[PDB]
Structure 1
Amino acid sequence: QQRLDSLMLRDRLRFSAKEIDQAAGKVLLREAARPEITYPDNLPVSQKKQDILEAIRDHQVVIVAGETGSGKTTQLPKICMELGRGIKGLIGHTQPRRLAARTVANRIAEELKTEPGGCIGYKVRFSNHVSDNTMVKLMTDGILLAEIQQDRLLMQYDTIIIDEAHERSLNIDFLLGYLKELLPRRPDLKIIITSATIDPERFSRHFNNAPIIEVSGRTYPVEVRYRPIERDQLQAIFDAVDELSQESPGDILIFMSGEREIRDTADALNKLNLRHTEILPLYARLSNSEQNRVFQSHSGRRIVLATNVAETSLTVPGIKYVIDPGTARISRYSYRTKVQRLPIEPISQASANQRKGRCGRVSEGICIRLYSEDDFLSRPEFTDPEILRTNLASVILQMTALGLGDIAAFPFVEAPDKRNIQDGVRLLEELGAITYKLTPLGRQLSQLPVDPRLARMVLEAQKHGCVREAMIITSALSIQDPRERPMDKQQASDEKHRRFHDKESDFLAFVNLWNYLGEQQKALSSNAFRRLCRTDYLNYLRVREWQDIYTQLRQVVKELGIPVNSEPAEYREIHIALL
């Protein structure tokens, strides 16, 4: 048994004698395939790698916290390899987003002059690029959670890097809880929690007061300019862009609430024909020749439009200026409507300071906040973690889908409100989702990224050929009402909104408004369809958010093989489905 501590972890678990020499050949082939480890000398993490290495070496859990762009994501797996990890088990490295897992794997592989799927591989939904020589496995946190069922000790891995951990999604908190549970039985496993410098002490306390290595390099103070306050919303961006294009060379990063807003803004900025200015929209659906032009050199000024993926996870090069509208989609349960919603809300101070911080890698960066200093100082210091703003039915459903056990025994970094547990269990039973074990219906519910009660209605519409109408309604119920009624009029707003009133149920006013919002962004220009939404007292951003949510929901529904009517269904099978 002393000889097999140099065997691979799954093999070593198996045995503990000449079928050992065989297994030991696997290790020694993998050691032969290990590349030469190199680092770009200009990154703070590369310069500070020796302290990081020693911390990982001497501690089971390390928290690495630092400004975006420090080199955490691309260099930390290399440090683990230099320390000798990744031979007898994999270095697992989670990302919140599927796109980031693949992009990071390709980037590290290229920096090491290797082929992705070799020493650096990745696993996301529909793509498992991992060979027998893979040492570092990039993946989404959802992928790693789904592996727990078939491998409860995670014996595939000798090292797990939880990246972007400050996002505090449910997936991240499930992993941090499961890993803490797992550590007494995996004394050979090493954990690295990787984060922006946002309250890393909370991660430290969770892991038995683990050391925090703060790896930020030099940052320069950023000038903040406050510019308070549809085109009133869009024109503020125009004014900020004009202001900043007077400053010294340097690209502008504009934070946006969603991809349809990015597209409208990119269309508008392009017809403005800014001299020697390139507009670059960052969408999730970008081509493989669009990936790197983000990172390609460029001649004039570049205006990058992005969602908050560019807040801390992605570093756009060459950024000197930021325009911050100060808002973001965030998942939040509404106690008024008893629905898990996606309101557009003012971001926390921590998030606003991360957006500002993207100008501070060079001197004299400028951040324009489209709101008042008064507003900023009123905002919370931190963003609520998702676990504290999600209905417990959704939480329990996902824990049951992953086999994480009872929500009351789980060692959360921050526990949800125990008073809501029984109503969450009750709801899932009434929805036919559980018995805890998932039902086949429950598994389909877990795969729909909307409130479970709304998801149940989508599944029921599949029996009646009106999933299209189910998705219009459910997406409409996942936002704040797009129909503004300013008591500054109260007069034309409701009389223009009653054009879509329906006979039986109020939910089909959403269907009529949806069809009306179609036929109009086809007739009208994108700037005069926009104009139509103040003319019609519609909140421009919510309508765009309504369309974004529907589009994403329809893609998921179709990917699951759920049928979607090509032709609008009629009123009877729409309501037997809701009723």
Structure 2
Amino acid sequence: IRLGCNVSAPSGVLERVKELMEDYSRAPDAKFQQQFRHLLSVNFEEFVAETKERNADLDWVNPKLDERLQLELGQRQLEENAKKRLEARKKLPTMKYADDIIQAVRENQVILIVGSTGCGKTTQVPQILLDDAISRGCASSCRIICTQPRRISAIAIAEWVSYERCESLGNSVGYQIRLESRKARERASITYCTTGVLLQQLQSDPLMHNLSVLILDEIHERSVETDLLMGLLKVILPHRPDLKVILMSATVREQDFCDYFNNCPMFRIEGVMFPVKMLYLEDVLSKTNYEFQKRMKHEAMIEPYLRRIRNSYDSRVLDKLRLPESEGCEDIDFIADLVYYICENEPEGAILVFLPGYDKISQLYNILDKPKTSKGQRWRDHMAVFPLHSLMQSGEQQAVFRRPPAGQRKVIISTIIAETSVTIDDVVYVINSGRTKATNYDIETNIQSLDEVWVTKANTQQRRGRAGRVRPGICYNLFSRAREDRMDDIPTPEILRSKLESIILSLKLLHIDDPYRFLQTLINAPNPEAIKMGVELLKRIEALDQTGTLTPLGMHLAKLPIDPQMGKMILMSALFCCLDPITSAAAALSFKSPFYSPLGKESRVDEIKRRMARNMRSDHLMVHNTIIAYRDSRYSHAERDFCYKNFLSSMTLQQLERMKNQFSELLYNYKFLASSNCKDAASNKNSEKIPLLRAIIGAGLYPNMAHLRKSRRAIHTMATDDGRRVNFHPSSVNSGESGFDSAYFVYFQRQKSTDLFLLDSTMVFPMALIIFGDGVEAGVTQNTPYLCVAKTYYFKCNRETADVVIQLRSNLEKLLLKKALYPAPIEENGYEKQLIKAIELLLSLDERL
């Protein structure tokens, strides 16, 4: 055992804390307390009974609305804005199956519609069922909900379906995504929403009584949400016989889903795309004649293959296949040469180049823009080159989607972002490197890594479709068909890679109290050891007790649309009057950073974040000052100038703001704040006290701690609480910085790519960890009295201070339990506030002189 710095407090401070705690300790309507006890006392069958009675709206029908919409449909099918658009609808394949689909839905609770891009299932199926219900005189009974994995898709589909019915958004078709909705009319309607929206609505309507038809789309993507939803349908459907479910899938392991709901009927609907030619690396080198130079297990792979193709290819091209750099994207000039090849032959169209990540996108961009070969210099000013990356601004401009200047060919250098997330319509040629990046969590080492991996056959096939949009295209896969036969079918289902605390918590409100048994019923069951690891995190933050049952605090956390650790932080910031900065850190960790990382500008982006951090040594506070500065740029009509100069996405900033107001309104509605405004003065009287904000941040990210021991840019000898050597990620504001006031940091995410990095960190002080953490004891080890936290970091601390901080933790634990059970804003001149001031007092001792 080593011993850290001294955290004993001056006697004058200790005795005012003693007086304050003693005033807290002379203290003597709860709707929330009844709801919480009611949830624990019900078994599942009485839970099912009660939800049925509380959600009964669709038990009511309006016959004059039934008959009036029945009439209006019949007449506007004689009209001529329809009767054009219905004969374009019937050119889509799905419409040929309308009647068989209507009948299969009537006879079966669950059906499955399998179709490729262009089949029209997503636009046409909901209309087929709705129009059928209106025609039969049943309009008011029908409420269709159709999920999508992505936000942009939900809106765009909804706007298109509304165009196909000659309606502005919001009468028969609507959408609903997080914090944005053009809601459809109540009945005889179709709504598109992100899968997560409907998961959040389950809390209020856990057996889906408020919809007559549920359609799940793109389930083949094996999103966490759709894998979760299908688990819950096996729980829900046996108590909802009148509910219809229509699963929808691409032709990607379609049979897994039909197997899963036990053999239910399955339609396969033809696609409409242009044919796209697949060439593998055999064919590319046979056509480009490129020449290379500047384990294996490659040749066990490549040589059996090279000889069932003896007579189909030249000798010299197959000698290139034996070089391990031939495949993938190890040689970027090879990729640059094939861009140059397509530019000369192979008539007009855009080139879409898939590379794994930021690093190789930068290389090929520099090669295409600062070419060193004569072939490239000819081509430099006849290409329009766009990098495409979630951290880059190109996606949020209109240029990459439009058609290039005359005489120039557009070339897009992109990550997997362009497979489904982003769609560009004039692409004719796909260069598929076959490599992307993926995050892999090892449960043994508790190390998450970001590694370069091969794509799956499902990826490769999606990328080939990206060329068949406007006209016949070509896909060049820079790997052999020997490499493809060693690719997996699909990527690892997202649920087996996910942290589970937040799912386990959400389930408790659906009265699914055993997560080991329930999660085992999913199409791919997560490892039970990951469930244990999720449950124990939840017991550590006291959302569950040691028998594993939900606690009043845990029920609050489960209703907040955010992972439970950062929920706890948001609630603490309500009780400790620092709401605005902490909701900002919370939103940024839940969603994204607002900073772009544009090519070539990495050194200038580093300086912008050091400037925005205001030397406060925290990536989290750094985000909040970004929001503060953003607000002032709108108050001054300098918004885009501000965003241009500092490489900020206004779109990410405005969303982060709507998340902060959504946390504020929720906390207000749960009776933890007096005002729903996250800028309210009463809610923010401590928002300028920096040592107090690092305490709240640590309360949320605990127990992810690290300790620094080195100097010199500077090099850092730092290790996390488990002993493993770490550094700050170079994107972090603490990367390379020297002269820290404290050697301790908390972090949200640790990750291995070249080294073991902390992606984000805030410098914390020992006394704040001790107050809000756990694993706290007082003792003596050498002849010195100590006070520890996590029984990992031990600090010199005299006994008079130790006895008070331990006493102070005890009262803070009793305060938190009661605020969770009997939520009320903490009154500004009451008993509870005296305890808060005691903690403020202790924490202020670490302020900068």
Pick one of 294, 310, 333 that aligns with 2:401.
294
Question: Aligned equivalents of 2:705 and 2:465: distance in 1?
Answer: 34
Partner of 2:352: 253
Relative to structure 2, which stretch is displaced further, 91-100 or 74-83? Answer: 74-83
Question: Residues 94 and 120 of structure 2 are in contact (CA less than 8 Å); yes or no, is this contact kept in structure 1?
Answer: no
Q: Which residues in structure 2 correspond to 1:405-554 (within 5 Å)?
A: 405-407=513-515, 408-409=517-518, 411-418=521-528, 420-435=530-545, 436-437=549-550, 439-440=553-554, 442-443=557-558, 447-448=562-563, 465=694, 499-502=715-718, 509-511=726-728, 513-514=730-731
> Aligned Cα RMSD in Å?
5.1
Question: Aligned equivalents of 1:82 and 1:315: distance in 2?
Answer: 30
Q: Which residues in structure 2 correspond to 1:323-402 (within 5 Å)?
A: 323-339=431-447, 343-360=451-468, 365-393=473-501, 395-400=503-508
Relative to structure 2, which stretch is displaced further, 245-254 or 169-178? Answer: 245-254
1:65, distance to aligned residue in structure 2 (A)? 2.0
Relative to structure 2, which stretch is displaced further, 96-105 or 259-268? Answer: 259-268
Pick one of 222, 226, 249 that aligns with 2:277.
222
Which amino acid letter does the alignment assign opposite residue 369 of structure 1?
N
Q: Which has the larger radius of gyration?
A: 2
Partner of 1:66: 115
Per-residue CA shift, 1:306-330, capped at 9, x if unaligned? Answer: 5435435665433322122323444
1:216, distance to aligned residue in structure 2 (A)? 2.9
Relative to structure 2, which stretch is displaced further, 192-201 or 103-112? Answer: 103-112
Question: Aligned equivalents of 1:128 and 1:64: distance in 2?
Answer: 27
Question: Aligned equivalents of 1:334 and 1:419: distance in 2?
Answer: 11
Pick one of 339, 342, 345 that aligns with 1:244.
342
1:123, distance to aligned residue in structure 2 (A)? 0.6
SS at match of 2:100: helix
Which amino acid letter does the alignment assign opposite residue 278 of structure 2?
E
Question: Aligned equivalents of 1:234 and 1:451: distance in 2?
Answer: 42
Partner of 1:181: 235
Q: Indicate yes or no: 2:179 matched with 1:80.
A: no
1:132, distance to aligned residue in structure 2 (A)? 2.3
Relative to structure 2, which stretch is displaced further, 68-77 or 568-577? Answer: 568-577
404 and 316 in structure 1: CA distance in 2 versus 1, 3 angstrom threshold: farther
Which amino acid letter does the alignment assign opposite residue 125 of structure 1?
R
Identity %: 26
Partner of 1:137: 191
270 and 146 in structure 1: CA distance in 2 versus 1, 3 angstrom threshold: farther
1:124, distance to aligned residue in structure 2 (A)? 0.8
426 and 500 in structure 1: CA distance in 2 versus 1, 3 angstrom threshold: closer
Question: Aligned equivalents of 2:54 and 2:541: distance in 1?
Answer: 43
451 and 379 in structure 1: CA distance in 2 versus 1, 3 angstrom threshold: farther
445 and 152 in structure 1: CA distance in 2 versus 1, 3 angstrom threshold: closer
1:569, distance to aligned residue in structure 2 (A)? 4.0
TM-score, normalising length: structure 2: 0.50
Relative to structure 2, which stretch is displaced further, 70-79 or 200-209? Answer: 70-79
SS at match of 1:180: helix
Question: Aligned equivalents of 1:113 and 1:293: distance in 2?
Answer: 30
Per-residue CA shift, 1:184-216, capped at 9, x if unaligned? Answer: 333333222222101111111222312222223
1:107, distance to aligned residue in structure 2 (A)? 2.6
Q: Indicate yes or no: 2:165 matched with 1:112.
A: yes
Question: Aligned equivalents of 1:318 and 1:450: distance in 2?
Answer: 44
Partner of 1:171: 225
Pick one of 33, 47, 54 that aligns with 2:93.
47
132 and 341 in structure 1: CA distance in 2 versus 1, 3 angstrom threshold: farther
SS at match of 1:245: helix
514 and 113 in structure 1: CA distance in 2 versus 1, 3 angstrom threshold: same
514 and 127 in structure 1: CA distance in 2 versus 1, 3 angstrom threshold: closer
Question: Residues 251 and 318 of structure 1 are in contact (CA less than 8 Å); yes or no, is this contact kept in structure 2?
Answer: yes
Unaligned runs of 5+ in 2: 1-51, 77-81, 282-325, 372-378, 573-584, 590-617, 621-691, 707-711, 738-751, 774-788, 791-849
Question: Residues 234 and 265 of structure 1 are in contact (CA less than 8 Å); yes or no, is this contact kept in structure 2?
Answer: yes
1:497, distance to aligned residue in structure 2 (A)? 12
Question: Aligned equivalents of 1:420 and 1:515: distance in 2?
Answer: 28
Partner of 2:63: 24
Which amino acid letter does the alignment assign opposite residue 224 of structure 1?
L
Question: Residues 124 and 143 of structure 1 are in contact (CA less than 8 Å); yes or no, is this contact kept in structure 2?
Answer: yes
Which amino acid letter does the alignment assign opposite residue 488 of structure 2?
P
SS at match of 2:280: strand
Relative to structure 2, which stretch is displaced further, 144-153 or 174-183? Answer: 174-183
Question: Aligned equivalents of 1:261 and 1:269: distance in 2?
Answer: 12
121 and 107 in structure 1: CA distance in 2 versus 1, 3 angstrom threshold: same
Partner of 1:196: 250
Which amino acid letter does the alignment assign opposite residue 431 of structure 1?
I
338 and 296 in structure 1: CA distance in 2 versus 1, 3 angstrom threshold: same
Alignment size in residue pairs: 511
Question: Residues 729 and 757 of structure 2 are in contact (CA less than 8 Å); yes or no, is this contact kept in structure 1?
Answer: no
SS at match of 1:62: strand
Relative to structure 2, which stretch is displaced further, 506-515 or 47-56? Answer: 506-515
Per-residue CA shift, 1:138-180, capped at 9, x if unaligned? Answer: 1100001111121223233222221111111210011112223
Per-residue CA shift, 1:194-248, capped at 9, x if unaligned? Answer: 221011111112223122222233663522232524x957555433432332322
1:298, distance to aligned residue in structure 2 (A)? 7.9
Per-residue CA shift, 1:337-361, capped at 9, x if unaligned? Answer: 3256655532222222222343356
295 and 55 in structure 1: CA distance in 2 versus 1, 3 angstrom threshold: farther
1:412, distance to aligned residue in structure 2 (A)? 2.1
Question: Residues 557 and 567 of structure 2 are in contact (CA less than 8 Å); yes or no, is this contact kept in structure 1?
Answer: no
Q: Indicate yes or no: 2:426 matched with 1:318.
A: yes
1:98, distance to aligned residue in structure 2 (A)? 1.9
Per-residue CA shift, 1:67-116, capped at 9, x if unaligned? Answer: 22333333333333333377523221111122221222223223433212
Question: Residues 93 and 119 of structure 2 are in contact (CA less than 8 Å); yes or no, is this contact kept in structure 1?
Answer: no
SS at match of 1:157: coil
Question: Aligned equivalents of 1:49 and 1:166: distance in 2?
Answer: 22
513 and 332 in structure 1: CA distance in 2 versus 1, 3 angstrom threshold: closer
271 and 347 in structure 1: CA distance in 2 versus 1, 3 angstrom threshold: same
Question: Residues 728 and 735 of structure 2 are in contact (CA less than 8 Å); yes or no, is this contact kept in structure 1?
Answer: no
Which amino acid letter does the alignment assign opposite residue 417 of structure 1?
N
Per-residue CA shift, 1:446-490, capped at 9, x if unaligned? Answer: 71499999999x98999652889999999999xxxxxxxxxxxxx
Partner of 1:103: 156
Question: Residues 162 and 193 of structure 1 are in contact (CA less than 8 Å); yes or no, is this contact kept in structure 2?
Answer: yes
SS at match of 2:92: helix
